[PDB]
Amino acid sequence: LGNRRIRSVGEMAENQFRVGLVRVERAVKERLSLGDLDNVMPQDLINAKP
DNA sequence: GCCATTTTCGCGGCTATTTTTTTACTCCCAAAGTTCCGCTATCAGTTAGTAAAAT
């Protein structure tokens, strides 16, 4: 039991939330690479559906 | 060219009963085929009326 670990609700929720964050980070980087950001606000960059 | 070693391939019990999942995204225009409402017109069925027949 020193080589086996307990992983509970908080850890799993954090892992899946980080997965979603990576999913949106890819698209955020892709958009920020374009350059035309004069009228771009942060809420126009983030898609919460993933 | 045969003897051994590494790599795929296929397998791992039977009946029941509780319950769906989830990202990602241009626009416009001209040309063409299809549909939906309205009207017509014909035929067949139904129904009302009247004469023919029978009591």
Swiss-Prot record:
Belongs to the RNA polymerase beta chain family. This is DNA-directed RNA polymerase subunit beta. Transmembrane segments: none annotated. The chain holds residues 448 to 497 of 1341 of the full protein. It comes from the Bacteria. It comes from Vibrio cholerae serotype O1 (strain ATCC 39541 / Classical Ogawa 395 / O395). The RNAP catalytic core consists of 2 alpha, 1 beta, 1 beta' and 1 omega subunit. When a sigma factor is associated with the core the holoenzyme is formed, which can initiate transcription. DNA-dependent RNA polymerase catalyzes the transcription of DNA into RNA using the four ribonucleoside triphosphates as substrates.
